[PDB]
Design an enzyme around this catalytic site. Structure first.
Site, PDB file in Angstrom:
ATOM      1  N   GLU A 100       0.803  -1.225   0.000  1.00  0.00           N
ATOM      2  CA  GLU A 100       0.000   0.000   0.000  1.00  0.00           C
ATOM      3  C   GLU A 100       0.838   1.278   0.000  1.00  0.00           C
ATOM      4  OE1 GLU A 100      -3.867  -2.077   2.086  1.00  0.00           O
ATOM      5  OE2 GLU A 100      -3.661   0.124   2.157  1.00  0.00           O
TER       6      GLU A 100
ATOM      7  N   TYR B 271     -15.427  -2.061   8.590  1.00  0.00           N
ATOM      8  CA  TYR B 271     -15.602  -1.066   7.536  1.00  0.00           C
ATOM      9  C   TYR B 271     -16.955  -0.374   7.634  1.00  0.00           C
ATOM     10  CZ  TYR B 271     -11.399  -2.615   5.051  1.00  0.00           C
ATOM     11  OH  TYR B 271     -10.107  -2.914   4.684  1.00  0.00           O
TER      12      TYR B 271
ATOM     13  N   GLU C 175     -15.171  27.201  -5.110  1.00  0.00           N
ATOM     14  CA  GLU C 175     -14.968  27.913  -3.847  1.00  0.00           C
ATOM     15  C   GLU C 175     -14.132  27.103  -2.852  1.00  0.00           C
ATOM     16  OE1 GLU C 175     -18.713  29.746  -2.386  1.00  0.00           O
ATOM     17  OE2 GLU C 175     -17.615  30.371  -0.564  1.00  0.00           O
TER      18      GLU C 175
HETATM   19  N1  LIG Z   1     -12.346   3.329   5.302  1.00  0.00           N
HETATM   20  C1  LIG Z   1     -12.439   2.284   4.479  1.00  0.00           C
HETATM   21  N2  LIG Z   1     -11.286   1.747   3.945  1.00  0.00           N
HETATM   22  C2  LIG Z   1     -11.351   0.698   3.090  1.00  0.00           C
HETATM   23  C3  LIG Z   1     -12.565   0.125   2.753  1.00  0.00           C
HETATM   24  N3  LIG Z   1     -12.305  -0.903   1.907  1.00  0.00           N
HETATM   25  C4  LIG Z   1     -10.970  -0.989   1.707  1.00  0.00           C
HETATM   26  N4  LIG Z   1     -10.370  -0.001   2.437  1.00  0.00           N
HETATM   27  C5  LIG Z   1      -8.937   0.289   2.519  1.00  0.00           C
HETATM   28  O1  LIG Z   1      -8.432   0.436   1.199  1.00  0.00           O
HETATM   29  C6  LIG Z   1      -7.241  -0.319   1.047  1.00  0.00           C
HETATM   30  C7  LIG Z   1      -7.571  -1.521   0.176  1.00  0.00           C
HETATM   31  O2  LIG Z   1      -7.971  -1.031  -1.078  1.00  0.00           O
HETATM   32  P1  LIG Z   1      -9.372  -1.391  -1.789  1.00  0.00           P
HETATM   33  O3  LIG Z   1     -10.260  -0.184  -2.094  1.00  0.00           O
HETATM   34  O4  LIG Z   1     -10.076  -2.477  -1.001  1.00  0.00           O
HETATM   35  O5  LIG Z   1      -8.793  -2.021  -3.158  1.00  0.00           O
HETATM   36  P2  LIG Z   1      -9.468  -1.822  -4.605  1.00  0.00           P
HETATM   37  O6  LIG Z   1      -9.613  -0.351  -4.942  1.00  0.00           O
HETATM   38  O7  LIG Z   1     -10.803  -2.552  -4.660  1.00  0.00           O
HETATM   39  O8  LIG Z   1      -8.349  -2.422  -5.612  1.00  0.00           O
HETATM   40  P3  LIG Z   1      -8.086  -3.985  -5.955  1.00  0.00           P
HETATM   41  O9  LIG Z   1      -8.965  -4.908  -5.121  1.00  0.00           O
HETATM   42  O10 LIG Z   1      -6.612  -4.204  -5.736  1.00  0.00           O
HETATM   43  O11 LIG Z   1      -8.444  -4.167  -7.405  1.00  0.00           O
HETATM   44  C8  LIG Z   1      -6.841  -0.796   2.423  1.00  0.00           C
HETATM   45  O12 LIG Z   1      -6.071   0.216   3.012  1.00  0.00           O
HETATM   46  C9  LIG Z   1      -8.201  -0.903   3.094  1.00  0.00           C
HETATM   47  O13 LIG Z   1      -8.155  -0.878   4.503  1.00  0.00           O
HETATM   48  C10 LIG Z   1     -13.744   0.661   3.287  1.00  0.00           C
HETATM   49  O14 LIG Z   1     -14.845   0.175   3.000  1.00  0.00           O
HETATM   50  N5  LIG Z   1     -13.671   1.744   4.148  1.00  0.00           N
END
Ligand SMILES: Nc1nc2c(ncn2[C@@H]2O[C@H](COP(=O)(O)OP(=O)(O)OP(=O)(O)O)[C@@H](O)[C@H]2O)c(=O)[nH]1
Ligand SMILES: Nc1ncnc2c1ncn2[C@@H]1O[C@H](COP(=O)(O)OP(=O)(O)CP(=O)(O)O)[C@@H](O)[C@H]1O
Ligand SMILES: Nc1nc2c(ncn2[C@@H]2O[C@H](COP(=O)(O)OP(=O)(O)O)[C@@H](O)[C@H]2O)c(=O)[nH]1
Ligand SMILES: [Ca+2]
Ligand SMILES: [Ca+2]
Ligand SMILES: [Ca+2]
Ligand SMILES: [Cl-]
Ligand SMILES: [Mg+2]
Ligand SMILES: [Mg+2]
Ligand SMILES: [Mg+2]
Lengths: 439, 427, 348, 54
Positions: A183, A224, A254
């Site tokens: 990440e 989540y 703005e």
């Molecule tokens: N706050 C919050 N963070 C999330 C959520 N889902 C995933 N994350 C965070 O986002 C990161 C993981 O990325 P994701 O958005 O799940 O990955 P993606 O965009 O679907 O990409 P790929 O699965 O690799 O194709 C990690 O840091 C997770 O903790 C969510 O529903 N809420």
């Protein structure tokens, strides 16, 4: 009235989008079937809520929203759940196999094959806007889609809508809920390619939201769902001025002119108060002074840093509920005598204040108690660069050994994009330091 | 990313493959006839990762059974779940491979491999989005070792963009069929280093010692060894078989576990260790045990190396707050053993459904530089024979030259040196 | 087992704190770059405060206060005293001082001119954060400052210091203050007098070995180093006895009350700027306050040192006090005081 | 402490308070980048298939 199109990318962006549009529907009195009894102009209108909802002849209020994910299971829950009727099938776009937590796979390999379909579905909504002002883009830094597809999407929106404003809501990676070791790579890569295309970006560190949920909502191990309901309240605070009558932050332009004097330093820190557990049987309602004071506690920020050791370039207070100006100014007076608030020498020491009288709506059965007044502060402080220093350090540790780099090179990315992106971040870290520190 | 195609090759591969399909069929509520009889929809949400649906509400394992002798596969067809396998997916010769990697890779196995790939192709073509392949086999015999790695090479040629995953049983003189096992293992490892993405090293050395020292089995059988293997295999595939966030498909697992392409040989672990007991296990006890060298299935001392990456999976109804607390305690109280140039290299999953006969269990998957001990061990046994060219005639008689042995040995010694590189790198 | 890292090799004080922590058998030392520590004994410059407090499962603590430099660099200290109402331009225990490279050079000469005007003693000393000039000639002050490179402060030289007898000599007082994570202010009960071993001569300011009481410059340039006490270091028992014998007072009444007053004022002033009360990481820090006593037994703050060493005969006791009240307060070990807690709540 | 630009409506009000005065790439370049990466992928694939053919 000018319309805003929301774009939700990847798991984080889509699930946060779910929580926001739910909250919007509660706040505006739009039912899950899309009907809105209080809207007396059936089939059209240019009310303030219409910046986010369009209308069908049958009275259906439809989000100006695109959901994009490279695998189907998360958007399939939207297609199938409480608000399935809200959305047109053409607004929910899924691939078959995802970006495997790999920026290069989401940007180069898989992005190339779906960018045209997405831009065409975005063009569908833009075509039904009399005066589109631009875009709100929800995504994670750390996922392969959220990072890699978004930066490609951002580049193309600059090409196809070069006049339009683009705002981000970005989830910054935290190990307590993170899904991938890489990440930090994905984060830096996507900040580098997106920086020039974004006008204002609101970063949410999952570590901060996680700790707010444990400490103030009494959630032993937040999910989540817990995080997103809290995030949606903050997004709602930030966007309420696009969706309701008022005179502060009424168009996307703005936000940039109020919060971003320097185009690269476009990452305002959000602080929200109060966060009160719905299971707290006895709660003494907090005053204007107490909730405003709480805006200067690091424990209430969306990113843990220390604004006492940077400088402010702008500060906006967004109140919801029983608030009048005189109690804001009294609270500000007291707070200035007691707190280290230093602005850069070339900006006025001041606050832009917006008040909407309707108190925050909360999701029935959710974790947040109803409160009589709440505030979200948006402050462009150089202390948020602490978050870039954390990320860049992790990036340096792995990249010095080229750990995991082959996953990216194998997708067609050149190893040198890594160090280009990292040098850009180094320039960003030094810009923040020039602005915010004396010798 | 849904379907996995499973291949089991040779005697060992088919015996552990069958036990694996038994164990996960019970977890998913599938019975010997392919009929579902379960209590939870968590059982079926990702059933199609491993099973095809045939009309009549029948679930058919996406499993291909390969051997050069018919013996062990006649046994599978007669075993408790033998009826569940698709009859066309049994691909066998008659010749045998004589515990001879050259026969499996170059002569006998070459004769049979095209028919195996016809069946692989037919299973792949019915896949909505094929993730890749898992192979179970031993490295010490001839079919699993020589023909298995031949299959892996041919599969990569036809599907170069899918993930290749193996469960590879390493030979040990303690549980030994023939003296040539170090030859077959070294030749196989050479293939594995280039053509798989992830390899679970199951050491017959470790499985024996667990059965002897820990489970108080005086004379362990292959049956007792395979109970440990099927339980470990169930654990390491939990994240693929049930809904979840972390390492939920083969490519995301590879991205989390493999920082350098060749260093993809994993040390698996399991807790609590059971033989074929009623005391409840606390989350602190699960966590101390899964990290205990005595629960590792690769006979390597984790304190002799450093962890590059770890994946931990907890199964059962327990407190996630306590799981996270205990995982954090392991890393913080033994931080020197986790490389500091891969931050937060330990990822943790929890699944509510436990394995049969336990209310709580934990599975460990580590990429440690201590795995070099395994390859050094094979390399010494290799060299002891190879310096006198002993038993080589069984291989040169099948067309092989000594130079192929010298190359495979050198590449495996390079793999040892690359692990030692990162065990010493400091950041 | 608690863990810690060491990032300032050149620290006399924390070298000893480290060694003491080891000898408890409950503190493991880690590599400089391992993030999974409870305690950072940090570097002196560009300490990465931004990376602290983001390790789940680790209460983290560091031995420096972010922002403390405002006290501990002489230019900032002058700015802090002049601009803060809680200290003020009216402050009675800080010498008249001006920052010279805003710059206050013209402000400096206007007050200097009523010295010329007023028949007042008007020698000044110029210092920066080697390179010290004492002279009653402004022209030679400002001349000196700019053929050097960096920022300087000009401070009124205290013309009538208290001189110890025998010897007609000068001295300064060093006080060690420890501020813990709760912002308790602990004054170590042992100070030290850094004495001049040369008699004080008000007629030649060009010679500075009777005017500068720094331990090095006396070990360096002075005939009589060690004549009266070990290493030009008189400790508090003897100095108290002298004040009783010679002046008919105690050290507590004539000097220490003022020292405690000055320490609390300075630290309570920057408390809102540097407190870690509700931060995600916590801080302590050891300071050294340097004081001068004029012949009326009035105390003046000279400077505040953010990274002090100790007196050699006091290292053992002080450093055990650091681990006792600053480190084990946060991280307890398995099952009187050398510090004076500075607290005062007058109601008005 | 000056309050300015006060605007009121039925839903709320806004104002400012001052404590102190003041002391892109083209489409073609993009499709180029996505095509250079795709060719680097096809080169690595062809080199693998060459080596597997040997
Ligand atoms: N706050 C919050 N963070 C999330 C959520 N889902 C995933 N994350 C965070 O986002 C990161 C993981 O990325 P994701 O958005 O799940 O990955 P993606 O965009 O679907 O990409 P790929 O699965 O690799 O194709 C990690 O840091 C997770 O903790 C969510 O529903 N809420
Ligand atoms: N206004 C003043 N009047 C009289 N003497 C003064 C003075 N200002 C400084 N001094 C003398 O200067 C000397 C200390 O100078 P300075 O404050 O710069 O210490 P320093 O930073 O160089 C070493 P350290 O920080 O370790 O104590 C003392 O001996 C003191 O007597
Ligand atoms: N763990 C385990 N190892 C086995 C089993 N059967 C054989 N082996 C090991 O596998 C190696 C022999 O290979 P085998 O699979 O029997 O030969 P193949 O049929 O030619 O592939 C030796 O190391 C044996 O110890 C088994 O059922 N379980
Ligand atoms: Ca309408
Ligand atoms: Ca633009
Ligand atoms: Ca034949
Ligand atoms: Cl446009
Ligand atoms: Mg995803
Ligand atoms: Mg056999
Ligand atoms: Mg054929």
């Amino acid at each position: 009235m000018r319309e805003c199109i929301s774009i939700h990318v990847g798991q984080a962006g889509v699930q946060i989008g779910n929580a926001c549009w739910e909250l919007y529907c509660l706040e505006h009195g739009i039912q899950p079937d899309g009907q809105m009894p209080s809207d007396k102009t059936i089939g059209g209108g240019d009310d303030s809520f219409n910046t986010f909802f369009s209308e069908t002849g049958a009275g259906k209020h439809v989000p100006r929203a695109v959901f994009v994910d490279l695998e189907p299971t998360v958007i399939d829950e939207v297609r199938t759940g409480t608000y399935r009727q809200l959305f047109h099938p053409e607004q929910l776009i899924t691939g078959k196999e995802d970006a495997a937590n790999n920026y290069a796979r989401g940007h180069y390999t898989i992005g190339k094959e779906i960018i045209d379909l997405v831009l065409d579905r975005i063009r569908k909504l833009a075509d039904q806007c009399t005066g589109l002002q631009g875009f709100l883009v929800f995504h994670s830094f750390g996922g392969g889609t959220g990072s890699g597809f978004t930066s490609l999407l951002m580049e193309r929106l600059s090409v196809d809508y070069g006049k339009k404003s683009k705002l981000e809501f970005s989830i910054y990676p935290a190990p307590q809920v993170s899904t991938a070791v890489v990440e930090p790579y994905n984060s830096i890569l996507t900040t580098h390619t997106t920086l020039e295309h974004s006008d204002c970006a609101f970063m949410v560190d999952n570590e901060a939201i996680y700790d707010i949920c444990r400490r103030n909502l009494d959630i032993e191990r937040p999910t989540y769902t817990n995080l997103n309901r809290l995030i949606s309240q903050i997004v709602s605070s930030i966007t309420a001025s696009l969706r309701f009558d008022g005179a502060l932050n009424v168009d996307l332009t703005e936000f940039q002119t109020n919060l971003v004097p320097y185009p690269r330093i476009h990452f305002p820190l959000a602080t929200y108060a109060p966060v009160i557990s719905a299971e707290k049987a006895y709660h003494e309602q907090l005053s204007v002074a107490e909730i405003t004071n709480a805006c200067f506690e690091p424990a209430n920020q969306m990113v843990k840093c220390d604004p006492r050791h940077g400088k402010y370039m702008a500060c906006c207070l967004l109140y919801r509920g029983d608030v009048v100006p005189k109690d804001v100014n009294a609270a500000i007076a007291t707070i200035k005598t007691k707190r280290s608030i230093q602005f850069v020498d070339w900006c006025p020491t001041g606050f832009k204040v917006g008040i909407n009288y309707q108190p925050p709506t909360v999701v029935p059965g959710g974790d947040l108690a109803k409160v009589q007044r709440a505030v979200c502060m948006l402050s462009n402080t150089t202390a948020i660069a602490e978050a870039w220093a954390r990320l860049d350090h992790k990036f340096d540790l792995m990249y010095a050994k080229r750990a995991f780099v082959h996953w990216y090179v194998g997708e067609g990315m050149e190893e040198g994009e890594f160090s280009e992106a990292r040098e850009d971040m180094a320039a960003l870290e030094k810009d923040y330091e020039e602005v915010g520190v004396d010798s | 990313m849904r379907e996995i195609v499973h291949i089991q090759a040779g005697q060992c591969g088919n015996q552990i493959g069958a036990k694996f399909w038994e164990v996960i069929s019970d977890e998913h509520g599938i019975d010997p006839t392919g009929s579902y009889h379960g209590d939870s929809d968590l059982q079926l949400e990702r059933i199609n990762v491993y099973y095809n649906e045939a009309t009549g509400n029948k679930y058919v394992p996406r499993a291909i059974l390969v051997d050069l002798e018919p013996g062990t596969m006649d046994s599978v067809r007669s075993g408790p779940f033998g009826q569940i396998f698709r009859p066309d997916n049994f691909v066998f010769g008659q010749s045998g491979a004589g515990n001879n990697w050259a026969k499996g890779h170059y002569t006998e196995g070459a004769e049979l491999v095209d028919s195996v790939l016809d069946v692989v192709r037919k299973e792949s073509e019915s896949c909505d989005c094929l993730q890749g392949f898992q192979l179970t086999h031993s490295l010490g015999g001839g079919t699993g070792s020589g023909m298995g790695t031949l299959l892996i090479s041919k599969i990569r040629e036809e599907y170069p963009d899918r993930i290749m995953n193996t469960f590879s049983v390493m030979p040990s003189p303690k549980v030994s069929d023939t003296v040539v096992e170090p030859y077959n293992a070294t030749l196989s490892v050479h293939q594995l280093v280039e053509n798989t993405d992830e390899t679970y090293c199951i050491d017959n050395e470790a499985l024996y010692d667990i059965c002897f020292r820990t489970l108080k089995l005086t004379t362990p059988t292959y049956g007792d060894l395979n109970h440990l293997v099927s339980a470990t295999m169930s654990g390491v595939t939990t994240c693929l078989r049930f809904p979840g966030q972390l390492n939920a498909d083969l490519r995301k697992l590879a991205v989390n576990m493999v920082p350098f392409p060749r260093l993809h040989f994993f040390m698996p672990g399991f807790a609590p260790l059971t033989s074929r007991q009623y005391r409840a296990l606390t989350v602190p006890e699960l966590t101390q045990q899964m990290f205990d060298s005595k629960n590792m299935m690769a006979a390597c001392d984790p304190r002799h190396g450093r962890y590059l990456t770890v994946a931990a999976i907890f199964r059962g109804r327990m407190s996630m707050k306590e799981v996270d607390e205990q995982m954090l305690n392991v890393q913080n109280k033994n931080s020197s053993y986790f490389v500091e140039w891969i931050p937060n290299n330990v990822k943790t999953a929890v699944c509510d459904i436990p394995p049969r006969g336990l209310k709580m269990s934990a599975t460990f998957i580590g990429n440690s530089t201590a795995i070099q001990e395994l390859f050094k061990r094979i390399s010494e046994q290799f060299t002891a024979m190879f310096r006198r060219k002993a038993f080589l005639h069984w291989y040169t008689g099948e067309g092989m030259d000594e130079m192929e042995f010298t190359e495979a040995e050198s590449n495996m010694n390079d793999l040892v040196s690359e692990y030692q590189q990162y065990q010493d790198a400091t950041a | 087992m608690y863990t810690f890292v060491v990032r300032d090799e050149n620290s006399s004080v924390y070298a000893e704190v480290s060694r003491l922590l080891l000898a408890t058998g409950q503190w493991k030392r880690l590599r400089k770059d391992n993030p999974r520590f409870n305690l950072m004994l940090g570097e002196r410059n560009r300490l990465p405060f931004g990376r602290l407090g983001h390790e789940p499962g680790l209460v983290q603590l560091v031995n420096y206060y972010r922002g403390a430099d405002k006290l501990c660099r002489k230019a900032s200290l002058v700015k802090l005293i002049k601009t803060s109402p809680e200290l003020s331009e009216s402050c009675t225990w800080f010498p008249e001082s001006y920052v010279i490279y805003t710059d206050e050079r013209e402000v400096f000469l206007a007050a200097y001119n009523r010295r010329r005007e007023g028949r007042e003693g008007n020698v000044w000393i110029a210092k920066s954060s080697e390179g010290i000039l004492i002279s009653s000639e402004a022209s030679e002050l400002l001349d000196f400052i700019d053929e050097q490179g960096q920022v300087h402060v000009i401070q009124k030289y205290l013309e009538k210091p208290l001189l110890l007898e025998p010897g007609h000599r000068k001295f300064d007082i060093r006080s060690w203050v420890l501020v813990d994570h709760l912002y308790n202010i602990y004054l170590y009960r042992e100070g030290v007098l850094r004495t001049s071993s040369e008699p004080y001569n008000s007629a030649n300011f060009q010679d500075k070995t009777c005017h500068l009481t720094n331990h090095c410059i006396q070990k360096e340039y002075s005939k009589n180093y060690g004549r009266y006490e070990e290493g030009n270091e008189m400790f508090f028992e003897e100095f108290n006895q002298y004040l009783m014998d010679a002046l008919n007072t105690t050290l507590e009444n004539s000097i220490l009350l003022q020292i405690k007053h000055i320490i609390r004022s300075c630290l309570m002033c920057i408390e809102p700027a540097i407190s870690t009360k509700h931060l995600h990481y916590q801080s302590f820090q050891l300071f050294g306050f340097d004081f001068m006593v004029d012949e009326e037994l009035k105390v003046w703050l000279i400077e505040v040192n953010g990274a002090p060493a100790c007196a050699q005969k006091l290292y053992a006791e002080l450093c055990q006090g650091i681990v006792d009240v600053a480190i084990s307060s946060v991280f307890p070990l398995a099952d009187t005081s050398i510090f004076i807690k500075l607290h005062h709540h007058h109601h008005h | 402490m000056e309050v300015i630009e006060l605007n009121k409506c039925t839903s709320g009000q806004s104002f400012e308070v001052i404590l102190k005065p003041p002391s892109d790439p083209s489409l073609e370049e993009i499709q180029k980048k996505l095509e250079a990466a795709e060719e680097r992928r096809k080169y690595q694939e062809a080199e693998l298939l060459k080596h597997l053919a040997e």
